Amino acid sequence: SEELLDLFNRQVTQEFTASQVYLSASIWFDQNDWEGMAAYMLAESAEEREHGLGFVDFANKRNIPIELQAVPAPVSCAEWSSPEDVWQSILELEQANTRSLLNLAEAASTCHDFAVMAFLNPFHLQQVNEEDKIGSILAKVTDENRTPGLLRSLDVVSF
Amino acid sequence: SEELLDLFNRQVTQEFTASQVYLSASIWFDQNDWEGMAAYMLAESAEEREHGLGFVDFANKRNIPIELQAVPAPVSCAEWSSPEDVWQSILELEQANTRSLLNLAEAASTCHDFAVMAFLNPFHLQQVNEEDKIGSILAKVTDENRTPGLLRSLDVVSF
Amino acid sequence: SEELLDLFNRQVTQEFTASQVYLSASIWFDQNDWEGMAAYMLAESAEEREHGLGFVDFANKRNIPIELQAVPAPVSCAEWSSPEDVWQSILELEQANTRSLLNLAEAASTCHDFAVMAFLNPFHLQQVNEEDKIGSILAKVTDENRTPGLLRSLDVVSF
Amino acid sequence: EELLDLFNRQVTQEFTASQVYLSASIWFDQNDWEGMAAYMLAESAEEREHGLGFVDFANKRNIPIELQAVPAPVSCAEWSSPEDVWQSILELEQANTRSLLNLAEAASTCHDFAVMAFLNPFHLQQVNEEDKIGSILAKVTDENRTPGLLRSLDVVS
Amino acid sequence: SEELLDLFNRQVTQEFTASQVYLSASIWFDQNDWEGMAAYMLAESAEEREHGLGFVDFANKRNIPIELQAVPAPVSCAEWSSPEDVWQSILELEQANTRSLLNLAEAASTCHDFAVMAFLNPFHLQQVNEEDKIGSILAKVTDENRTPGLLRSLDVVSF
Ligand SMILES: [Fe+3]
Ligand SMILES: [Fe+3]
Ligand SMILES: [Fe+3]
Ligand SMILES: [Fe+3]
Ligand SMILES: [Fe+3]
Ligand SMILES: [Fe+3]
Ligand SMILES: [Fe+3]
Ligand SMILES: [Fe+3]
Ligand SMILES: [Fe+3]
Ligand SMILES: [Fe+3]
Ligand SMILES: [Fe+3]
Ligand SMILES: [Fe+3]
Ligand SMILES: [Fe+3]
Ligand SMILES: [Fe+3]
Ligand SMILES: [Fe+3]
Ligand SMILES: [Fe+3]
Ligand SMILES: [Fe+3]
Ligand SMILES: [Fe+3]
Ligand SMILES: [Fe+3]
């Protein structure tokens, strides 16, 4: 019971942690003049914030008390020295959002909490699409960057 | 007091000097068949002329006498043998426009000339955006030109 | 700063003093059948009251207490005998308004009151425009009035 | 090529004229002739467009252009009334016309039919311009015979 | 006199010869799967036909008898083994159209035939723009083809 409350609460922190990692990725791309990839990251930073606010709003409706935790400093921007490194961290970040949601669904399932299971369904399916989209961008970036300059030519055109 | 008059007057010459450097860059790019970069430079040549005319118009309103100086021949087109060289001179040129405006703001500040400080504010912020935009283009051009031909393929698509 | 609060209060008084002086000019012009110059003066009497109202609204928001002072009786109308005299008094009035504003900005700058200085900026620039416009009308009035009846032909035309 | 040199000098002459027009705009604004000031500011932008048109044709025709300094205007020092300013501007347009005719004579000697064709609309624009300027100068010279009267007509044009 | 008739007549053959060379270039590009460059050539083939018909129409109006000559087989498509070779032949072809028009203008000039000189003026200026545009495309193609594959990537995007 309490475990469900705790995992709901942790989900909000995970989505806001992901919002800040995406903002860090936007900064790294703008600082290195990848304005197209920076705008994509900034849009995802706002979207993850929206995911967190949806969990807050449902929790309030369901009388699940939310206590906002610290949103950790992103520190993957330590590692990053090329756009591949940034997109690989973003892929790992979406995988962690997916695992957080599955853990939460498992707790709900154990509790027979059908309303929380229902609420999570569109997020499970969102995550499938997000991991697919980021996986695909990572593949494109890794392939284009085999030729000097070429990756730039595709921040400019796409994004 | 007089120093403020002189620096106002010099600002007009700096913006018209920059207008002519951008026209020289347009010529170098058209002569070398970079029609996209040439059209960007020609647009900036007109914009710097507009900055100079705004300083003339304010000076007339504020009874700061303007005496138009010679606009020097651009001679950076000596150096240029690749688009990187052109964009690097343009970056240096915007940095000199920014320094000219800051010197002018310092004189105004010393004189407690609040109207001239206010007038300069949108130009300080314009310059921040211009140095950022030219820095970013220079980075893109330097990276694309690591592969023969590739830079061309992006005059054509962007610009 | 007592100085800064008093000068803010004084600025409201100066804008309302100027409103009344413009209304006095409108009466002189209407009495002497210069209906075009009267309507100009009436529009400016309303604009200077809007300036004073702008200062009262910002003072209220910034917790600057406003004590409304008397708006003195205009005295120049006792001595005006031609349009040139009236326009010369309005130029002087505008020069006063600008001095009052620069005094207030000097007090704000000493107090490092960044918000008050930022509020004043559009008024600094408006005064450059108003002094230029009045000085140019005064110049046209003074030249046209060298031929009998010619200035009348220009209240009728412009205004 | 004296042809090449004259084509470069034409760019410099148009930008020289742009600056002389801007200097006339400033003398008029300083002296509260805002109407005549706006006419000269428009001409200053038009002359810069004539120079840009020359640069563009030279780039297409592979005529190398090397931008020269644009000399500071000096006729403002002597102006004391609008008639002086307008008289300098008529002299400036006569100089622009002469520069175009010198370029056209070299193109004709060279049998450069493309450059002669390119110049034709500029020869006709100069006729129109010298006419308009000579007409305004005549109107200003006549109106300024009565004190104040010229002013009364800046404000109405 | 007769020389003017002959050179008018030869101009029609030159424009129709150029129409067929452009059609040959379209075929070579379609056969080698350069559909963007093929469509440009086909458009120029129709345009040169239009230039020839304009000369026919003026000649009819001016009572210059036209006798249509054989339009020669294009045989530059012998040489061609890369798009650079095609564009270089097209540049040479526009240079020959320009020379044909200048020869014709010289004959008209000698004859003091002011109507034929006037008629040719827009064609002299068309040619300046055409040689500039083809020169520029040739430069782009020669530079892009320094990297395998890259030129293709710009038939697809431009054209
Ligand atoms: Fe997302
Ligand atoms: Fe997304
Ligand atoms: Fe999320
Ligand atoms: Fe996500
Ligand atoms: Fe700019
Ligand atoms: Fe720009
Ligand atoms: Fe500038
Ligand atoms: Fe700039
Ligand atoms: Fe006002
Ligand atoms: Fe006003
Ligand atoms: Fe006021
Ligand atoms: Fe006022
Ligand atoms: Fe003109
Ligand atoms: Fe001109
Ligand atoms: Fe002109
Ligand atoms: Fe064509
Ligand atoms: Fe074409
Ligand atoms: Fe043709
Ligand atoms: Fe052609």
Residue numbers in the entry:
A (entry chain F), B (entry chain F), C (entry chain A), E (entry chain F): 1 to 159
D (entry chain B): 2 to 158
Paper quotes:
A novel ferritin was recently found in Pseudo-nitzschia multiseries (PmFTN), a marine pennate diatom that plays a major role in global primary production and carbon sequestration into the deep ocean. Ferritin is a 24-mer that forms a hollow sphere, takes up soluble ferrous iron, oxidizes it at di-iron ferroxidase centers, and stores the iron oxide mineral in its central cavity. Sites A and B comprise the conserved ferroxidase active site, and site C forms a pathway leading toward the central cavity where iron storage occurs. The structures confirm the typical ferritin arrangement: 24 subunits assemble to form a hollow spherical shell.
To determine whether occupation of ferroxidase sites and site C is time-dependent, apo-PmFTN crystals were soaked for 5 min, 45 min, 4 h, and overnight in 2 mm ferrous sulfate. Structures of crystals exposed to ferrous iron for 4 h or longer revealed iron bound in all three sites as well as up to two additional sites at the inner surface of the ferritin sphere. The latter two sites may serve as the nucleation site for formation of the mineral core. All but one of the crystals analyzed were of space group P23 with eight ferritin monomers in the asymmetric unit. A bridging oxygen atom is modeled between sites A and B and between sites B and C. A second solvent oxygen atom is coordinated to iron in site A. The bridging solvent molecule between sites A and B might be a bridging oxo group rather than a water molecule, building a diferric-oxo bridge as seen in other ferritins. Sample electron density for the overnight-soaked structure at the ferroxidase site including the bridging ligand is presented in Fig. 2D. Glu-130 adopts multiple conformations depending on the soaking time and is observed coordinated to iron atoms in site B and/or site C. In the overnight-soaked structure, Glu-130 is tilted toward the iron in site B, whereas in the 4-h-soaked structure, it is predominately coordinated to site C. The distance between the iron atoms in sites A and B is ∼3.8 Å in Fe, which decreases to ∼3.6 Å upon overnight soak. In PmFTN, iron occupancy at both sites is only observed after prolonged iron exposure, and the site A and B intermetal distance of less than 3.8 Å decreases only slightly with time to 3.6 Å, suggesting that in the structures where iron is bound to both sites it is in the Fe(III) state.
